[PDB]
Amino acid sequence: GRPCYTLQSCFPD
């Protein structure tokens, strides 16, 4: 649902 941006390239949720 919400944007997930991290160092390991988080997935969307």
Coordinates of C-alpha atoms in Angstrom, one line a residue:
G1 CA 0.0 0.0 0.0
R2 CA 2.5 2.6 1.2
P3 CA 5.9 3.4 -0.5
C4 CA 8.7 1.3 0.9
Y5 CA 12.2 2.6 0.1
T6 CA 15.3 1.2 1.8
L7 CA 18.9 0.2 1.3
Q8 CA 17.9 -3.3 0.3
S9 CA 15.2 -2.0 -2.0
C10 CA 12.0 -2.6 0.1
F11 CA 8.9 -3.8 -1.6
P12 CA 5.6 -1.9 -1.9
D13 CA 2.8 -2.6 0.6

